[PDB]
C-alpha cells in the first residue's frame, strides 16, 4: 500500500557539539547587523546548562586572546633583583599601614655596560620580605614564572563578543523568562549567532551581566550538593562605586633596546585605602528576594545565614576585578553578614595588587602598569556565586570563571541539522 | 516562513519548507574556522553522494520503489501526516532507518541494471 | 452539514459556450479533489471531468478533452466548467462532486462522498 | 576557444562553450592557498545547489516553465541572441535578477508536488 | 563484498560493486590533514563535473551515443566481460581515454542542444 518516501530539507536536528567561531564590532567575523531570530511557534526542547560545550569553548577563547595580547609586550626579568624596601614619606592612615613600600634596586639600561638606580612604589602584597642580605625583599613571582608586562596601549574593556552557528548548525534559545537552566523550555527560538557577552571577569559578584525578566532566579546543577555552586541572577541591578582616591605620578624608564617600564614614582596628597560603595537599602532589599527565592529549595520555616568567605587565597576571598585598569580585592564581609529568620552605604574595604595571574595558572604572571591620576568606576551586581555549608549558612565563592561564563550562556544550546529523513507516502515510480 | 519555522508544525506542512533549509546547509586564530567551512561542506557531500546512490538526485522529494514493512511503523496516513512534527516521527522510525537506506540503496542498483537491459 | 450548489446556465445554442460554477461550503474547500459528473436526461451517470484540490492538475474523458475547461478558487470555494462548441450530445444534468482523488500524503478516495443537485444544461 | 574566449562573442555564440567555462571553475605562510581552495569549492556548490532547487540539476542549458515578464528586458529575441554579448545581457537585468531567481523556485515546488501526486 | 574486494573479479561480477568504491571516496600541525581533506574533495568534485558534463548525472551505470572505434581495443563482449578484471582492462585502454572523454563532451552538447530545439 504505502511506500518510502525521502525528503530533504526536513527541519529537525540532534543534540551537538561543533566549533562556534565569534564575531565583534585580536578580532574575527565582523558583527552580524541582524541576528533573524526565528520564533518555532509550537517546538519545545531540552536545555542542560552545566553540560553546554559553548561554555568550553568561550572559556579557552578568552583565555588564548588574554595570552595573545601579551606577546609583544617587555618582559621584565631584569627586574628579579634584590630591593631596598622601607616605609613611604607621607601622611599614611591606619587603613593603609605599611601597605606601600618604598623600594630602590639597580635596574638595567640601554647599555650593558651601564646600570641604573631607580625606586618605586610598590603595593605589600607585591613583594615577599626574603633575601636578607645587604637588602630587604624581592618581587613576588621571581621564584615561579618570569613577569611581563601588560603593554600600556591595550585597555581590559570587556568589549562583547557575539557566537556564530557554522553553516549546518543552529543555536536555540530559550525564552522562557522562568528557566532555571535545565529541562524542558516550552518557548524556543532559533538564532543565527547569540547576543553579545562581555567577557567581564570577577569573582564573588557578578558584573555587567543581564538581569532575571521578572524574578531573581537560582540555578545550581544539584541544589541539595554542597559541592556545586549556586549561581544567582537578579532581578534588579545593584549599583557599586570603586574607587582608588590617591593622585599617582607615573613614571618611566629604559630597561633595555626600546623596552620602556612603568612605575608609580610617588603619590600626591594622602594615602587613603581604595574602597567599594554598595547602598545599604538596596543591598538588604537583594537579600531579601534572595532569601524569599532559597526557601522554595529548602524547608519554608527556616534560617538563611550569610557569611564571609572562610578560606583560600586572595583571589577567592575577595572579590576581584578589573576598575580601570587596576585590579582590586574587595573585601564583601560587610555584605554577607547576616540572619534571616522566617542615604547610608556599606563601604568595602579593596587591596590592589601589580602583579596578578588571572587565570587559575601557574607558569604565568602580569605586571599592570600603575596608572595615573584617581579611578573612579561604577558597575552593576547582575548576580551572585554563593555556596552552601537548622540554619542554611551560605557564603560567597566564583573561584572558577566558568560560572560566570555559564550566567549568559545558559540560554543557548548548540544543534545539527539533519535535513535528509524517509516517511510512507502512496507515492510510487 | 523562515529557517526552521515549520519544525514545531504538522509534517504535511513542513514538507512545503524543504528549500528553506536546504538553503541553510551552505554557508592557531582562524584555524578553527577554516576547519568548520570544510566540515561542513563534507556533510553536504555525503547527503548529496547518498541521494544520489538512491537515485534521488538533484530533487527535494523522490518517490522509490521500497514498501513501508508495517513493522517500522503502523500509523496511518492521516496519523503521521496530519499530526506528528517531523521531530516526533524522526525519534519514532530513527532505530529501523539503517535498514531503510540499506533498502533504498539495493531498489537502486535493481533498477540501473533493469535500464541497462531496456536500453539494449 | 457539506453543501454544493450549482449556479449554472441554462438553454443555449450549439457550437456556443456555456460556464457552469459551484459554490461550496461546510468543509474546507481546499482540502478536496472535485469533479463533474453528467446525466443525460434517459442516461445514467457519466464522469466527465476531475481536479486536484490545489488545481494544478486537471483530467478529461476524451469526448471533451479538446473543448473543456475545469479550474478552482479556493479562496472563494468555487469550482468551475467552461464548456465550448456545445454538441447537443451535452445535453445533460451536470452535477458537482467531491471526491474521485487524494493528494499522496492523504487516505485514498477514488469515490464521490458528496453531491450537489445539478445544473441543467440544454443545448439545442 | 579557451576560457571566456567567447566573452566577446555574441550570447547566441557563446552559448556552445558553456563546458569550456564550465570545466575551469574547480583546481602562516600558505594558509591563505587552503582558504583559497575551500572558497573556489564553497562558491561551486552554491551554484550547484541552486540549480538543483530550479530543477536544472546536471545539465548546462535547462529550460523552465517560467514566463518573461517584458518588464524585466522588452527586447525582440534576435536583439538579444545575436547583437548583444552576456556582458552587456547581464548589466541590462542586474537589478531583475533575484527576481527571477525566487520565480524559478516557486515554479519548482509546484513542479515537484504536482508529479508525486500524479504518481499515486 | 567490502572496498575493492572485486578488484580481483571479472568486469561483470564487479560492477555489482559501485556502490561499494562509491561510498569510500568521502569520509603547522594539522594543516596537512586539512590539505588531505580538501584534495579528498576537489577529486570527488571533479568526477561529478565530469560526470555532469557527459550527461550522466545522478547514476552509477551511464549509456551513452559514442560508439566504440574499434582502434581503442577490438576485443570482445565475452573476453573484455568475462576474462578480463578492471585493472586490466583501465591498462589496456589507458592511452585513448583523453580521446574518449572528448567524444563524450561532444555527443552531449549535441543532445542539449537538439532537445532544447525539440522542446519549442
Ligand atoms: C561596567 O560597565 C561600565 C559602563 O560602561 C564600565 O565603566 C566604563 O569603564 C571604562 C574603562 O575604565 C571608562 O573608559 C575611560 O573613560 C575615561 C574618561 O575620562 C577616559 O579618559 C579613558 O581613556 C584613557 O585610557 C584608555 C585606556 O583605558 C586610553 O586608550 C585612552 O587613550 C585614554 O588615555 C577611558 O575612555 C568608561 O568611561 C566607563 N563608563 C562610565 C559610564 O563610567 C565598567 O568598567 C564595567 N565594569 C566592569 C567590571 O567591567
Ligand atoms: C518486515 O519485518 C519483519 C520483522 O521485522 C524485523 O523487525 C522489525 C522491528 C524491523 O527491525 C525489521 O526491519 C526487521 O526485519 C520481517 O520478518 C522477519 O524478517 C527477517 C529478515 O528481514 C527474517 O530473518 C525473520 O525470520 C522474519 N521473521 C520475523 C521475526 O518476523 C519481514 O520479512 C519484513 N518484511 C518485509 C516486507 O521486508
Ligand atoms: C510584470 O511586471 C509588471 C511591473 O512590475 C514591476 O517591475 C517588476 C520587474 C517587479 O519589480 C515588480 O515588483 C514591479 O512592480 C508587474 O506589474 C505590477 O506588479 C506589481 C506586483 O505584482 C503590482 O503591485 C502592480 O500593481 C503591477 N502593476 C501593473 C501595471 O499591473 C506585473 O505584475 C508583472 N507580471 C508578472 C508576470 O509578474
Ligand atoms: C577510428 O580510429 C581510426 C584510427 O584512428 C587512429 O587511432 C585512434 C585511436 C586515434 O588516435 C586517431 O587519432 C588515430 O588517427 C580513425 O581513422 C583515422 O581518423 C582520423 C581522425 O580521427 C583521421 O585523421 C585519419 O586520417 C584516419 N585514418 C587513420 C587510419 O589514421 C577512424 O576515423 C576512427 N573512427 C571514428 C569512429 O572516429
Ligand atoms: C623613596 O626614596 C628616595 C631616595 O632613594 C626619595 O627621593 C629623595 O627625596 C629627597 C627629599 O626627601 C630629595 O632631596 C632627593 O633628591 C630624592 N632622591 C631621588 C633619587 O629622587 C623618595 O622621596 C622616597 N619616596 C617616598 C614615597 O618615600
Ligand atoms: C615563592 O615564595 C612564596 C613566599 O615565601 C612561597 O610561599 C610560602 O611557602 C612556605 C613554605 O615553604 C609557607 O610556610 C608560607 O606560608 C608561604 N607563603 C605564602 C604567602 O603563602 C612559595 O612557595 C614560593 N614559590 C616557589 C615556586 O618556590
Ligand atoms: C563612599 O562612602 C563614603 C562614606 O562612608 C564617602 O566618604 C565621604 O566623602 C565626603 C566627600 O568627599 C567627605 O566629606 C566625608 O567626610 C567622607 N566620609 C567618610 C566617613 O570618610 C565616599 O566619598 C564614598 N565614595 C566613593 C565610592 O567614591
Ligand atoms: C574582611 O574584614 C574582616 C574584619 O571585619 C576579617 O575578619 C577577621 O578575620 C580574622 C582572621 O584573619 C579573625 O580572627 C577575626 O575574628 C575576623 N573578624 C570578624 C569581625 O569576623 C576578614 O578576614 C576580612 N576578609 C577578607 C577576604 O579580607
Ligand atoms: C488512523 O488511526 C487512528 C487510531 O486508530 C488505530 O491506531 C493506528 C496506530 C493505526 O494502527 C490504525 O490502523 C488504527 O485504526 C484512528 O483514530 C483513525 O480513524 C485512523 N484513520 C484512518 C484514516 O484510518
Ligand atoms: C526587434 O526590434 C528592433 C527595434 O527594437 C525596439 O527597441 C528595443 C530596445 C526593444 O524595445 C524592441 O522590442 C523594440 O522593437 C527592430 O529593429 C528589429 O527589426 C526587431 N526584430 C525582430 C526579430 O522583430
Ligand atoms: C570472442 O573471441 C573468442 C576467441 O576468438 C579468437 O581469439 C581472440 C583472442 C581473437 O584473436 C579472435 O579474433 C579469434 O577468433 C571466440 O571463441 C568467441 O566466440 C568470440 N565471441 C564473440 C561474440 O565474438
Ligand atoms: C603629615 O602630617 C602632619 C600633621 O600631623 C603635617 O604637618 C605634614 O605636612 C604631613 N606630611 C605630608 C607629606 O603630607
Ligand atoms: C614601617 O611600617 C611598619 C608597618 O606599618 C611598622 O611596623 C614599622 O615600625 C615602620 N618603620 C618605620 C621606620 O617607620
Ligand atoms: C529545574 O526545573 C526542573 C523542572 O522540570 C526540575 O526538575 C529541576 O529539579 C529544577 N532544578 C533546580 C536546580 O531548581
Ligand atoms: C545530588 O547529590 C546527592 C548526594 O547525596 C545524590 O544522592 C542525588 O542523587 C544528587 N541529585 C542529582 C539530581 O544529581
Ligand atoms: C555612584 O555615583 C553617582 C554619580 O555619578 C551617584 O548618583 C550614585 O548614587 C552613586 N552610587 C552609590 C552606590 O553610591
Ligand atoms: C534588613 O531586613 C531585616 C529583616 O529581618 C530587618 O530587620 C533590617 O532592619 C533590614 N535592614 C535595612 C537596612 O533595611
Ligand atoms: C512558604 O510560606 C509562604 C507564606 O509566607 C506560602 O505562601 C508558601 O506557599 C509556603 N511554601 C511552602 C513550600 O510551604
Ligand atoms: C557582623 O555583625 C555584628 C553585629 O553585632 C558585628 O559585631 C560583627 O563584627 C560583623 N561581622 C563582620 C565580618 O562584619
Ligand atoms: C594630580 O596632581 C597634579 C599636580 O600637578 C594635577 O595637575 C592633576 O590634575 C592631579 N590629578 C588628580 C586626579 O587629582
Ligand atoms: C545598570 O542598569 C541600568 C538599567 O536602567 C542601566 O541604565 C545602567 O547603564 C547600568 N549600569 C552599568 C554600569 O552598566
Ligand atoms: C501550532 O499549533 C496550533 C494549534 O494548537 C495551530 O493552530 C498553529 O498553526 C501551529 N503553528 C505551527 C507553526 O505549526
Ligand atoms: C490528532 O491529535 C488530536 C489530539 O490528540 C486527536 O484528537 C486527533 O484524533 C488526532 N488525529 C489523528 C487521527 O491523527
Ligand atoms: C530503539 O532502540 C533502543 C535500544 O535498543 C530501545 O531502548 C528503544 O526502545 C528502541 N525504540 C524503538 C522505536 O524500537
Ligand atoms: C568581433 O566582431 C566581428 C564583426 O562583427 C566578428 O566578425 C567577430 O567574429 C567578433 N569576435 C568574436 C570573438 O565574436
Ligand atoms: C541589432 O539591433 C539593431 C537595432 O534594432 C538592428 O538595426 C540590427 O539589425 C540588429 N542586428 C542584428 C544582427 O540583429
Ligand atoms: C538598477 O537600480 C539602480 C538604482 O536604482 C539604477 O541606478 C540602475 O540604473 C538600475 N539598473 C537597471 C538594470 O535598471
Ligand atoms: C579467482 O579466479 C578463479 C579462477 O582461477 C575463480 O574461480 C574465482 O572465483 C576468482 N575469485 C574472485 C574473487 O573473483
Ligand atoms: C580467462 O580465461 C582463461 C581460459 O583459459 C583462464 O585460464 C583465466 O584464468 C581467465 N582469467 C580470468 C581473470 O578469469
Ligand atoms: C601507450 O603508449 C605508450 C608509449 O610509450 C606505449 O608504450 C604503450 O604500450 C601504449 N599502450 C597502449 C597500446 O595502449
Known amino acids: 500500500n504505502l511506500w518510502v518516501t525521502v525528503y530533504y530539507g526536513v527541519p529537525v536536528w540532534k543534540d551537538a557539539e561543533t566549533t562556534l567561531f565569534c564575531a565583534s564590532d585580536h578580532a574575527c567575523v565582523p558583527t552580524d547587523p541582524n541576528p533573524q531570530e526565528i520564533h518555532l511557534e509550537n517546538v519545545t526542547e531540552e536545555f542542560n546548562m552545566w553540560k553546554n560545550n559553548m561554555v568550553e569553548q568561550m572559556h579557552e577563547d578568552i583565555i588564548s586572546l588574554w595570552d595573545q595580547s601579551l606577546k609583544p609586550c617587555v618582559k621584565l626579568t631584569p627586574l628579579c633583583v634584590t630591593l631596598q624596601c622601607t616605609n613611604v614619606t607621607n601622611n599614611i592612615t591606619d587603613d593603609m599601614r605599611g601597605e606601600l613600600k618604598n623600594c630602590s634596586f639597580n635596574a638595567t639600561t640601554e647599555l650593558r655596560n651601564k646600570r641604573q638606580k631607580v625606586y618605586s612604589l610598590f603595593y605589600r602584597l607585591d613583594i615577599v620580605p626574603m633575601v636578607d642580605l645587604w637588602t630587604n625583599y624581592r618581587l613576588i613571582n621571581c621564584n615561579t614564572s618570569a613577569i611581563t608586562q601588560a603593554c600600556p596601549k591595550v585597555s581590559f574593556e570587556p568589549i562583547p563578543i557575539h557566537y556564530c552557528a557554522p553553516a549546518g548548525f543552529a543555536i536555540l534559545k530559550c525564552k522562557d523568562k522562568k528557566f532555571n537552566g535545565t529541562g524542558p523550555c516550552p518557548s524556543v527560538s532559533t538564532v543565527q549567532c547569540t547576543h553579545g557577552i562581555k567577557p567581564v571577569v570577577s569573582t564573588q559578584l557578578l558584573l555587567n551581566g543581564s538581569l532575571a525578566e521578572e524574578e531573581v532566579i537560582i540555578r545550581s546543577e544539584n541544589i541539595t550538593n554542597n559541592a556545586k555552586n549556586i549561581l544567582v541572577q537578579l532581578n534588579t541591578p545593584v549599583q557599586i562605586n570603586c574607587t582608588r582616591p590617591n593622585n599617582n605620578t607615573v613614571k618611566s624608564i629604559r630597561i633595555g633596546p626600546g623596552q620602556a617600564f612603568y612605575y608609580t614614582g610617588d603619590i600626591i596628597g594622602d594615602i587613603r585605602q581604595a574602597h567599594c560603595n554598595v547602598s545599604k537599602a538596596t543591598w538588604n532589599e537583594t537579600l531579601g528576594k534572595v532569601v524569599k527565592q532559597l526557601r522554595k529549595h529548602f524547608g519554608n520555616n527556616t534560617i538563611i545565614r550569610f557569611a564571609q568567605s572562610s578560606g583560600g587565597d586572595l583571589e577567592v576571598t575577595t572579590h576581584s576585578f578589573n576598575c580601570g585598569g587596576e585590579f582590586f580585592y574587595c573585601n564583601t564581609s560587610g555584605l554577607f553578614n547576616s540572619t534571616w529568620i522566617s542615604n547610608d552605604s556599606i563601604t568595602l574595604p579593596c587591596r590592589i595588587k601589580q602583579i596578578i595571574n588571572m587565570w587559575q595558572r601557574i607558569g604565568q604572571a602580569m605586571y599592570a602598569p600603575p596608572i595615573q591620576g584617581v579611578i573612579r568606576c561604577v558597575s552593576n551586581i547582575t548576580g551572585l556565586i554563593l555556596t552552601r555549608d537548622t540554619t542554611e549558612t551560605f557564603r560567597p565563592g566564583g573561584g572558577d570563571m566558568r560560572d560566570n561564563w555559564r550566567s549568559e550562556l545558559y540560554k543557548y544550546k548548540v544543534v545539527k541539522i539533519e535535513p535528509l529523513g524517509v516517511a510512507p507516502t502512496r507515492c510510487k515510480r | 516562513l523562515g529557517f526552521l519555522g515549520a519544525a514545531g508544525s504538522t509534517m504535511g506542512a513542513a514538507s512545503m519548507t524543504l528549500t528553506v533549509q536546504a538553503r541553510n546547509l551552505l554557508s592557531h586564530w582562524g584555524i578553527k574556522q577554516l576547519q568548520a567551512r570544510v566540515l561542513a561542506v563534507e556533510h553536504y557531500l555525503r547527503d548529496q553522494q547518498l541521494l544520489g546512490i538512491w537515485g534521488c538526485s538533484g530533487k527535494l522529494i523522490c518517490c522509490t520503489n521500497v514498501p513501508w514493512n508495517s513493522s517500522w511503523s503502523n500509523r496511518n496516513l492521516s496519523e503521521i501526516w496530519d499530526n506528528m512534527t517531523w521531530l516526533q516521527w524522526d525519534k519514532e522510525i530513527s532505530n529501523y532507518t539503517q535498514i531503510i537506506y540499506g533498502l533504498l540503496e539495493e531498489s537502486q542498483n535493481q533498477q540501473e541494471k533493469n535500464e541497462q537491459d531496456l536500453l539494449a | 452539514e457539506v453543501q454544493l450548489v450549482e449556479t449554472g446556465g441554462g438553454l443555449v445554442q450549439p457550437g456556443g459556450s456555456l460556464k457552469l460554477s459551484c459554490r461550496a461550503s461546510?468543509?474546507?474547500?481546499?482540502?478536496?479533489?472535485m469533479s463533474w459528473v453528467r446525466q443525460a436526461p434517459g442516461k445514467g451517470l457519466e464522469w466527465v471531468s476531475l481536479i486536484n484540490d490545489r488545481g494544478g492538475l486537471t483530467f478529461y474523458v476524451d469526448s471533451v478533452k479538446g473543448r473543456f475547461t475545469i479550474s478552482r478558487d479556493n479562496s472563494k470555494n468555487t469550482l468551475s466548467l467552461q464548456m465550448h462548441s456545445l454538441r447537443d450530445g451535452d445535453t445533460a444534468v451536470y452535477y458537482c462532486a467531491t471526491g474521485g482523488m487524494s493528494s499522496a500524503l492523504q487516505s485514498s478516495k477514488y469515490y464521490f462522498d458528496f453531491w450537489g443537485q445539478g445544473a441543467l444544461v440544454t443545448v439545442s | 576557444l579557451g576560457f571566456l574566449g567567447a566573452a566577446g562573442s555574441t550570447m547566441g555564440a557563446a552559448s556552445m562553450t558553456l563546458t569550456v567555462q564550465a570545466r575551469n571553475l574547480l583546481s602562516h605562510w600558505g594558509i591563505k592557498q587552503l582558504q583559497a581552495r575551500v572558497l573556489a569549492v564553497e562558491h561551486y556548490l552554491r551554484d550547484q545547489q541552486l540549480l538543483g532547487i530550479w530543477g536544472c540539476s546536471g545539465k548546462l542549458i535547462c529550460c523552465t516553465n517560467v514566463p518573461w515578464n517584458s518588464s524585466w528586458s522588452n527586447r525582440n529575441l534576435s536583439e538579444i541572441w545575436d547583437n548583444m554579448t552576456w556582458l552587456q545581457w547581464d548589466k541590462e537585468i542586474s537589478n531583475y535578477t533575484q527576481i527571477i531567481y525566487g520565480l524559478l523556485e516557486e515554479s519548482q515546488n509546484q513542479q515537484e508536488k504536482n508529479e508525486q501526486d500524479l504518481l499515486a | 563484498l567490502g572496498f575493492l574486494g572485486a578488484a580481483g573479479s571479472t568486469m561483470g561480477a564487479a560492477s555489482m560493486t559501485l556502490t561499494v568504491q562509491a561510498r569510500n571516496l568521502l569520509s603547522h600541525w594539522g594543516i596537512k590533514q586539512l590539505q588531505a581533506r580538501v584534495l579528498a574533495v576537489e577529486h570527488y568534485l571533479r568526477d561529478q563535473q565530469l560526470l555532469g558534463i557527459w550527461g550522466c548525472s545522478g547514476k552509477l551505470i551511464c549509456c551513452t551515443n559514442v560508439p566504440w572505434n574499434s582502434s581503442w581495443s577490438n576485443r570482445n563482449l565475452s573476453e573484455i566481460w568475462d576474462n578480463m578484471t578492471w585493472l586490466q582492462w583501465d591498462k589496456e585502454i589507458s592511452n585513448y581515454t583523453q580521446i574518449i572523454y572528448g567524444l563524450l563532451e561532444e555527443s552531449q552538447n549535441q543532445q542539449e542542444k537538439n532537445e532544447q530545439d525539440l522542446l519549442a
Open positions: 461546510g468543509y474546507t474547500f481546499s482540502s478536496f479533489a
